[PDB]
Amino acid sequence: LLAEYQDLTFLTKQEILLAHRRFCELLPQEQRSVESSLRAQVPFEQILSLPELKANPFKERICRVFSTSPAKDSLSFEDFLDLLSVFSDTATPDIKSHYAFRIFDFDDDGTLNREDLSRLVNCLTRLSASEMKQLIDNILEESDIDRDGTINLSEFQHVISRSPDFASSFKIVL
Ligand SMILES: [Ca+2]
Ligand SMILES: [Ca+2]
Ligand SMILES: [Ca+2]
Ligand SMILES: [Ca+2]
């Protein structure tokens, strides 16, 4: 499937152009030409102030997932478009689940462990105490098919099918 290497067609032409105008506001005046702006790398601090990210519980993590920089320390305009495409209401549930999973996998090991799931739950929530353990045990009980103690992507889709609340995280996070 290789979502990252797909050319996503979720944004309209106007959205693309408007995104470019907003991206250019983060650049020095001299880098705002079309050609200069598409070579630019914008550090996360400027991206993190945007309305799409400022109050996002996983904002630092979202920056890292969409950055195509090998240092994972900035977004190009194209990374920013990728971001807005996945965030759009038009983005398909399969694309959103893919990227939500990546976001929630903090160590990028390919699974959601007890810590990964804890942050997810906190994001929905006066937080839970050590009743967080109770909750996580029941998710694994239902959806940890290979019984490895973690939740992989397939199992994640099961959880999403089971829980309106976890499914609502897609609107919160993307
Ligand atoms: Ca690309
Ligand atoms: Ca959205
Ligand atoms: Ca993980
Ligand atoms: Ca598992």
Swiss-Prot record:
Remaining remarks: The binding of either calcium or magnesium significantly increases the structural stability of the protein in comparison to apo-CIB (calcium- and magnesium-free form).
Domain EF-hand: 92-125, 131-166
Name under which the protein is recorded: Calcium and integrin-binding protein 1
Binding annotation for Ca(2+) 2: 144, 146, 148, 150, 155
Membrane topology category: Lipid-anchor
Induction / repression: Up-regulated during breast cancer progression.
Subcellular location: Membrane; Cell membrane, Sarcolemma; Cell membrane; Apical cell membrane
Annotated binding of Ca(2+) 1, by residue: 105, 107, 109, 111, 116
Keyword terms: Angiogenesis, Apoptosis, Calcium, Cell adhesion, Cell cycle, Cell division, Cell membrane, Cell projection, Cytoplasm, Cytoskeleton, Differentiation, Golgi apparatus, Lipoprotein, Magnesium, Membrane, Metal-binding, Myristate, Nucleus, Phosphoprotein, Repeat, Spermatogenesis
Impact upon substituting residue 116 to N: Cytoplasmic localization
Purpose: Calcium-binding protein that plays a role in the regulation of numerous cellular processes, such as cell differentiation, cell division, cell proliferation, cell migration, thrombosis, angiogenesis, cardiac hypertrophy and apoptosis. Involved in bone marrow megakaryocyte differentiation by negatively regulating thrombopoietin-mediated signaling pathway. Participates in the endomitotic cell cycle of megakaryocyte, a form of mitosis in which both karyokinesis and cytokinesis are interrupted. Acts as a restriction factor that promotes keratinocyte-intrinsic immunity to human beta-papillomaviruses (HPVs).
Subunit structure: Monomer. Interacts with MYO1C. Interacts (via C-terminal region) with PPP3R1 and CACNA1C; the interactions increase upon cardiomyocytes hypertrophy. Interacts with the heterodimeric integrin alpha-IIb/beta3 (ITGA2B-ITGB3). Interacts with ITGA2B (via cytoplasmic domain); the interaction is direct and calcium-dependent. Interacts with the protein kinases PLK2/SNK and PRKDC (via the region immediately upstream of the kinase domain). Interacts with PLK3; the interaction inhibits PLK3 kinase activity. Interacts with PSEN2. Interacts (via C-terminus) with F8. Interacts with NBR1 (via C-terminus). (Microbial infection) Interacts with human papillomavirus 4/HPV4 protein E8, human papillomavirus 5/HPV5 protein E1, and human papillomavirus 16/HPV16 proteins E2 and E5.
Clinical disorder: Epidermodysplasia verruciformis 3: A form of epidermodysplasia verruciformis, a rare genodermatosis associated with a high risk of skin carcinoma that results from an abnormal susceptibility to infection by specific human papillomaviruses, including the oncogenic HPV5. Infection leads to the early development of disseminated flat wart-like and pityriasis versicolor-like skin lesions. Cutaneous Bowen's carcinomas in situ and invasive squamous cell carcinomas develop in about half of the patients, mainly on sun-exposed skin areas. EV3 inheritance is autosomal recessive.
Gene of this entry: CIB1
SMART domains recorded: EFh (SM00054)
Free-text tissue specificity from the UniProt record: Ubiquitously expressed. Expressed in the epidermis, hair follicles and keratinocytes. Detected in platelets and in cell lines of megakaryocytic and erythrocytic lineages. Both isoform 1 and isoform 2 are detected in various cancer cell lines, with isoform 2 being the predominant form (at protein level).
Outcome recorded upon mutating residue 156 to A: Loss of binding to ITGA2B. Does not inhibit interaction with PAK1
InterPro entries for this protein: CIBP, EF-hand-dom_pair, EF_Hand_1_Ca_BS, EF_hand_dom
